[PDB]
Structure formats: C-alpha cells, structure tokens
CSV table of C-alpha atoms and ligand atoms in Angstrom, one decimal:
chain,number,residue,atom,x,y,z
F,1,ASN,CA,-0.3,-0.2,0.0
F,2,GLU,CA,1.5,3.4,-0.4
F,3,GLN,CA,4.5,2.3,-2.2
F,4,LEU,CA,2.6,1.7,-5.1
F,5,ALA,CA,1.6,5.0,-6.0
F,6,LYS,CA,4.6,5.7,-6.4
F,7,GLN,CA,5.5,3.3,-8.6
F,8,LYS,CA,3.0,5.2,-10.3
F,9,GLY,CA,3.5,8.7,-9.9
F,10,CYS,CA,-0.1,9.8,-9.1
F,11,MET,CA,1.5,11.7,-6.2
F,12,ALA,CA,2.2,14.1,-8.6
F,13,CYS,CA,-0.9,15.7,-8.6
F,14,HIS,CA,-3.2,13.5,-6.3
F,15,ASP,CA,-2.5,14.4,-2.4
F,16,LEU,CA,-3.9,12.9,1.1
F,17,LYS,CA,-4.2,16.0,2.6
F,18,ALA,CA,-2.6,18.3,0.1
F,19,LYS,CA,-5.5,19.9,-2.9
F,20,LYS,CA,-3.2,19.8,-5.2
F,21,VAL,CA,-3.2,19.1,-9.4
F,22,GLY,CA,-5.2,16.4,-8.1
F,23,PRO,CA,-8.2,16.1,-5.7
F,24,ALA,CA,-6.2,14.9,-2.7
F,25,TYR,CA,-7.1,11.0,-2.6
F,26,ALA,CA,-8.2,11.8,1.0
F,27,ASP,CA,-11.3,14.1,-0.3
F,28,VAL,CA,-12.7,12.3,-3.2
F,29,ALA,CA,-12.8,8.9,-0.7
F,30,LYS,CA,-14.8,10.5,1.2
F,31,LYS,CA,-17.2,12.1,-2.1
F,32,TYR,CA,-16.8,8.6,-2.1
F,33,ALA,CA,-17.2,7.0,1.2
F,34,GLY,CA,-21.3,6.5,0.5
F,35,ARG,CA,-20.7,4.3,-1.6
F,36,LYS,CA,-21.0,1.2,-2.5
F,37,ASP,CA,-19.3,1.4,-6.2
F,38,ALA,CA,-16.8,4.0,-6.0
F,39,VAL,CA,-14.5,0.7,-6.2
F,40,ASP,CA,-15.5,0.4,-10.7
F,41,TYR,CA,-16.1,4.0,-11.2
F,42,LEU,CA,-12.9,5.2,-10.0
F,43,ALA,CA,-10.6,2.7,-11.5
F,44,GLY,CA,-13.2,2.9,-14.6
F,45,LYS,CA,-11.8,6.6,-15.4
F,46,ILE,CA,-7.9,5.3,-14.0
F,47,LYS,CA,-7.7,2.9,-16.5
F,48,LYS,CA,-9.3,6.3,-19.1
F,49,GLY,CA,-7.8,9.3,-17.5
F,50,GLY,CA,-9.7,12.7,-18.7
F,51,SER,CA,-11.4,14.3,-15.9
F,52,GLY,CA,-14.9,15.8,-15.9
F,53,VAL,CA,-15.9,15.3,-11.9
F,54,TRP,CA,-13.5,17.9,-11.1
F,55,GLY,CA,-11.7,20.0,-13.1
F,56,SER,CA,-10.5,20.0,-16.5
F,57,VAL,CA,-7.4,19.4,-16.8
F,58,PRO,CA,-7.2,15.3,-18.0
F,59,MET,CA,-5.3,13.0,-16.2
F,60,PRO,CA,-2.7,11.6,-17.9
F,61,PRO,CA,-4.1,7.7,-18.9
F,62,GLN,CA,-2.0,5.0,-17.1
F,63,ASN,CA,-1.6,1.2,-17.8
F,64,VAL,CA,-3.1,-1.1,-15.5
F,65,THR,CA,-6.1,-3.4,-15.0
F,66,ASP,CA,-9.5,-3.4,-13.4
F,67,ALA,CA,-7.8,-5.9,-10.9
F,68,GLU,CA,-5.2,-2.2,-10.1
F,69,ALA,CA,-7.7,-0.4,-10.8
F,70,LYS,CA,-8.9,-2.1,-7.7
F,71,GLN,CA,-7.0,-1.9,-5.6
F,72,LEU,CA,-6.6,2.7,-6.1
F,73,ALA,CA,-9.9,2.6,-5.9
F,74,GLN,CA,-9.8,0.6,-2.5
F,75,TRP,CA,-6.3,2.1,-1.7
F,76,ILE,CA,-7.5,6.0,-2.3
F,77,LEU,CA,-11.6,5.6,-1.0
F,78,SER,CA,-9.2,4.1,2.1
F,79,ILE,CA,-7.7,7.0,2.8
F,80,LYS,CA,-9.3,10.1,4.5
D,1,LIG,C1,-1.6,15.3,-12.5
D,1,LIG,C2,-1.3,15.6,-14.1
D,1,LIG,C3,-2.7,14.1,-12.2
D,1,LIG,C4,-1.1,13.2,-12.3
D,1,LIG,C5,-0.6,13.2,-12.6
D,1,LIG,C6,-2.7,11.4,-11.7
D,1,LIG,N1,-4.1,12.0,-11.8
D,1,LIG,FE1,-5.5,11.9,-11.2
D,1,LIG,N2,-6.2,12.9,-11.8
D,1,LIG,C7,-6.1,13.8,-11.9
D,1,LIG,C8,-6.9,15.1,-12.1
D,1,LIG,C9,-7.3,16.0,-12.1
D,1,LIG,C10,-8.3,13.8,-11.5
D,1,LIG,C11,-9.5,14.9,-12.1
D,1,LIG,C12,-10.2,15.0,-12.3
D,1,LIG,C13,-11.5,15.4,-13.1
D,1,LIG,O1,-11.9,16.5,-13.6
D,1,LIG,O2,-12.8,14.2,-13.0
D,1,LIG,C14,-7.8,13.1,-11.2
D,1,LIG,C15,-9.0,11.7,-10.2
D,1,LIG,C16,-8.2,10.9,-10.7
D,1,LIG,C17,-8.7,9.2,-10.5
D,1,LIG,C18,-11.0,10.0,-10.3
D,1,LIG,C19,-11.6,9.3,-11.5
D,1,LIG,C20,-12.8,9.3,-11.5
D,1,LIG,O3,-13.8,9.5,-9.8
D,1,LIG,O4,-14.1,8.9,-12.3
D,1,LIG,C21,-8.5,7.9,-10.6
D,1,LIG,C22,-8.3,6.8,-9.9
D,1,LIG,C23,-7.2,9.1,-10.5
D,1,LIG,N3,-7.2,10.3,-10.7
D,1,LIG,C24,-5.8,7.6,-10.4
D,1,LIG,C25,-5.0,7.9,-10.7
D,1,LIG,C26,-4.0,8.1,-10.8
D,1,LIG,C27,-4.0,6.2,-10.2
D,1,LIG,C28,-2.7,8.2,-10.8
D,1,LIG,C29,-1.5,7.3,-11.5
D,1,LIG,C30,-1.6,6.4,-12.3
D,1,LIG,C31,-3.1,9.5,-11.2
D,1,LIG,N4,-4.5,9.7,-10.9
D,1,LIG,C32,-2.1,10.3,-12.0
D,1,LIG,C33,-4.9,14.7,-11.8
D,1,LIG,C34,-4.0,13.7,-11.9
C-alpha cells in the first residue's frame, strides 16, 4: 500500500491531505465513501483518465488493469 502510488507517480497531482493539481485522495474518498460502487467508477476513470468531475485538466492515462484499478479505488477510498 502507499508504495504503489509511487511506482505509478499519481502523487504528481493527488495528495492525501494536500489539494494539489488533483483532488487529494482523502477528499475524493469521503466523497465516494458513502457509495457502494466507488471501486468500478474510480478504476473506470483510472485506466481511461480525462476529467470533468473534479476539473478539466485531462489527467494522463495509465497502464493498469481492472484488478490494479480496484486496489486504487480501494486504497484511495480507505484513505480519509
Ligand atoms: C496530474 C497530472 C495527475 C496525475 C499525475 C494523476 N492524476 Fe488522477 N486525476 C487528476 C485530476 C485532475 C483528476 C480529476 C479530473 C476530473 O475532473 O475528474 C484525477 C482523477 C483521478 C481519479 C478519479 C477517477 C474518477 O473518479 O472517475 C482517479 C481514480 C485517479 N485520478 C487516479 C490516478 C492514478 C492512479 C494516477 C497515477 C497512475 C493518477 N491519477 C495520476 C490528475 C492527475
């Protein structure tokens, strides 16, 4: 956990409690913490990228698979 975001380099904009170029993973988690499919949705935009729900900066695409996409929404959501 955690070390994963490094191998990818998502912190370049995201941030647990630091609203930087991207919505702090902690903030997004709470926003999707009251949901039940935050895993599919998130990962759905993780392998696609883009934007429109938090801003416009088309986040750069990534090379992850469904499984990896799950750990991202599961690891980012658990973060508060
Ligand atoms: C800055 C260039 C970014 C880097 C690097 C990464 N992400 Fe990102 N991400 C960024 C923004 C600005 C947004 C919001 C765009 C919008 O308006 O919606 C996002 C969003 C995500 C999301 C949300 C998916 C969703 O809710 O549909 C996820 C899951 C996400 N980003 C994952 C992610 C990962 C895994 C990264 C490293 C591989 C990563 N992002 C880098 C900006 C940036």
